[PDB]
């Protein structure tokens, strides 16, 4: 079995020092950049963290082969057997929740706006921080020990019949169960992406100022419902409350249906639509516009009124000349961007390229959901197919050599595979992250 015994010693000296720098490297930029970005980022973090403990144990292996002798603690021995078993099955359950993390904020931006935040990632992070710890650490620690021999050679190492039921089990769920869900999630946000016209302005509003189904107040103080959609100017809510109600009509006692919110909106563009032509600066820029940058040209004049958008005479001017280049440039400095750079750069990008793909990036989207899947099924499939025919083998299988010796001949290989998945893990991080929305809905001081 010599492919088993010296291939661990090459693979874990080159896996090690891959891994632990990327890996470092990863985390150091994770802390400092964009201050607690996202919610995926802490589904990331914790993979990095679950890594690094399995990748700081890997030189202690690569010595109890080279030298064939294990100088170190009893406590060590289990934490080597244990901290792979750990990396590995929480690697799998973390890249699974970034999956549906993705899968949710992609397909439903609207609805699972509250089932995804920090508090609530935070909470799965230790809700599989204690599965795995707890499955790993009490197996580790009672299965493998430093007194195989411990004279003038120490070794840190049937109840198989016994012992592969519960390794079919966690193998089933653990594995299968995460494997089915990352397609399924994966297969859906495809799906999406197929649909046609999936963003349009009512969407691109969402994004960039929100959508809140209650009545609520202003920046301005004014009482406000939907996007932007604005009840009444008294500071009296229970005159709010019945201007509403003439709008929608049927006494809804201050929530309205994401369907009545896009409704007033509509309303809203038309008579914003109407005001653009109306104010002469802007009408020749607006019918020189496309419809998409129609829609960035109305999402100006949502954050600002027409008067406020007929300031920047300087762009618009090249805006009408098809400068587009040029305008995003002018537009890239003005007191307007620094307030909201997120939804002004946003806007600046379809302004310029004429395209959705700020709001919405396709390409991006899909290279995600390639990079995921190929990594995730490539680094686990071939390491967990081979333990399920090594429990069945070692008692139903029965079909041989054949049965038994290719079986054992594929272990060392899927293994080395799956540990792996540390030097594969940044890129999965890069790519999630092409994805993740720049702004979002609340918590922001200016919202019209």
Same mark, same amino acid.
């Given at each position: 079995?010599?492919?088993?015994?010296?291939?661990?010693?090459?693979?874990?000296?080159? @896996?090690?020092?891959?891994?632990?720098?990327?890996?470092?490297?990863?985390?150091?930029?994770?802390?400092?950049?964009?201050?607690?970005?996202?919610?995926?980022?802490?589904?990331?973090?914790?993979? @990095?963290?679950?890594?690094?403990? *399995?990748?700081?144990?890997?030189?202690?292996?690569?010595?109890?082969?080279?030298?064939?002798? +294990?100088?170190?603690?009893?406590?060590?021995?289990?934490?080597?057997?244990?901290?792979? %078993?750990?990396?590995?099955?929480?690697? &799998?359950? *973390?890249?699974?929740?970034?999956?549906?993390?993705? #899968?949710?904020?992609?397909?439903?931006?609207?609805?699972?706006?509250?089932?995804?935040?920090?508090?609530?990632?935070?909470?799965?992070?230790?809700?599989?921080?204690?599965?795995?710890?707890?499955?790993?650490?009490?197996?580790?620690?009672?299965?493998?020990?430093?007194?195989?021999?411990?004279?003038?050679?120490?070794?840190? *190492?049937?109840?198989?019949?016994?012992?592969?039921?519960?390794?079919? #089990?966690?193998?089933?769920?653990?594995?299968?169960?995460?494997?089915?869900?990352?397609?399924?999630?994966?297969?859906?946000?495809?799906?999406?992406?197929?649909? /046609?016209?999936?963003?349009? &302005?009512?969407?691109?509003?969402?994004?960039?100022?929100?959508?809140?189904?209650?009545?609520?107040?202003?920046?301005?103080?004014?009482?406000?419902?939907?996007?932007?959609?604005?009840?009444?100017?008294? /500071?009296?809510?229970?005159?709010?409350?019945?201007?509403?109600? $003439?709008?929608?009509?049927?006494?809804?006692?201050?929530?309205?249906?994401?369907?009545?919110?896009?409704?007033?909106?509509?309303?809203?563009?038309?008579?914003?639509?109407?005001?653009?032509?109306?104010?002469?600066?802007?009408?020749?820029? %607006?019918?020189?516009?496309?419809?998409?940058?129609?829609?960035?040209?109305?999402?100006?004049?949502? =954050?600002?009124?027409?008067?406020?958008?007929?300031?920047?005479?300087?762009?618009?001017?090249?805006?009408?000349?098809?400068?587009?280049?040029?305008?995003?440039?002018?537009?890239?400095?003005?007191? +307007?961007?620094?307030?909201?750079?997120?939804?002004?750069?946003?806007?600046?990008?379809?302004?310029?390229?004429?395209?959705?793909?700020?709001?919405?990036?396709? $390409?991006?989207?899909?290279?995600?959901?390639?990079?995921?899947?190929?990594?995730?099924?490539?680094?686990?499939? /071939? %390491?967990?197919?081979?333990?399920? *025919? %090594?429990?069945?083998?070692?008692?139903?299988?029965? $079909?041989?050599?054949?049965?038994?010796? @290719?079986?054992?001949?594929?272990?060392?290989?899927?293994?080395?595979?799956?540990?792996?998945?540390?030097?594969?893990?940044?890129?999965?991080?890069?790519?999630?992250?092409?994805? &993740?929305?720049?702004?979002?809905?609340?918590?922001?001081?200016?919202? =019209?």
């Amino acid at each position: 079995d010599n492919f088993k015994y010296p291939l661990y010693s090459m693979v874990f000296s080159i @896996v090690f020092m891959v891994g632990l720098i990327t890996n470092v490297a990863a985390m150091y930029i994770f802390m400092c950049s964009l201050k607690l970005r996202n919610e995926t980022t802490t589904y990331m973090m914790n993979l @990095v963290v679950s890594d690094l403990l *399995f990748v700081l144990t890997l030189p202690l292996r690569v010595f109890y082969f080279v030298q064939q002798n +294990w100088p170190f603690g009893s406590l060590l021995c289990k934490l080597s057997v244990s901290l792979f %078993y750990t990396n590995m099955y929480g690697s &799998i359950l *973390f890249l699974t929740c970034i999956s549906v993390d993705r #899968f949710l904020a992609i397909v439903y931006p609207f609805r699972s706006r509250g089932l995804r935040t920090k508090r609530n990632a935070k909470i799965v992070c230790a809700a599989v921080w204690v599965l795995v710890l707890s499955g790993s650490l009490p197996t580790g620690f009672m299965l493998n020990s430093t007194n195989k021999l411990e004279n003038n050679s120490i070794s840190c *190492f049937e109840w198989k019949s016994h012992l592969s039921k519960v390794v079919i #089990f966690i193998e089933t769920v653990g594995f299968l169960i995460p494997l089915m869900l990352n397609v399924v999630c994966s297969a859906m946000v495809l799906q999406t992406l197929r649909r /046609p016209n999936t963003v349009n &302005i009512f969407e691109m509003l969402r994004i960039d100022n929100g959508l809140r189904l209650k009545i609520y107040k202003n920046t301005e103080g004014y009482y406000t419902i939907g996007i932007g959609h604005l009840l009444t100017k008294s /500071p009296s809510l229970n005159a709010a409350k019945s201007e509403l109600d $003439k709008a929608i009509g049927r006494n809804t006692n201050g929530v309205i249906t994401k369907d009545e919110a896009e409704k007033l909106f509509n309303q809203d563009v038309d008579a914003a639509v109407r005001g653009i032509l109306r104010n002469a600066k802007l009408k020749p820029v %607006y019918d020189s516009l496309d419809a998409v940058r129609r829609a960035a040209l109305i999402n100006m004049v949502f =954050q600002m009124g027409e008067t406020g958008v007929a300031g920047f005479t300087n762009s618009l001017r090249m805006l009408q000349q098809k400068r587009w280049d040029e305008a995003a440039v002018n537009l890239a400095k003005s007191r +307007w961007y620094n307030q909201t750079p997120n939804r002004a750069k946003r806007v600046i990008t379809t302004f310029r390229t004429g395209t959705w793909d700020a709001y919405l990036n396709k $390409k991006k989207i899909l290279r995600m959901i390639i990079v995921h899947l190929f990594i995730f099924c490539f680094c686990f499939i /071939p %390491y967990n197919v081979n333990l399920v *025919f %090594y429990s069945l083998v070692r008692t139903n299988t029965l $079909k041989g050599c054949a049965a038994e010796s @290719v079986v054992r001949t594929i272990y060392p290989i899927a293994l080395c595979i799956a540990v792996s998945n540390c030097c594969f893990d940044p890129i999965v991080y890069y790519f999630t992250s092409e994805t &993740i929305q720049n702004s979002a809905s609340s918590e922001d001081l200016y919202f =019209q």
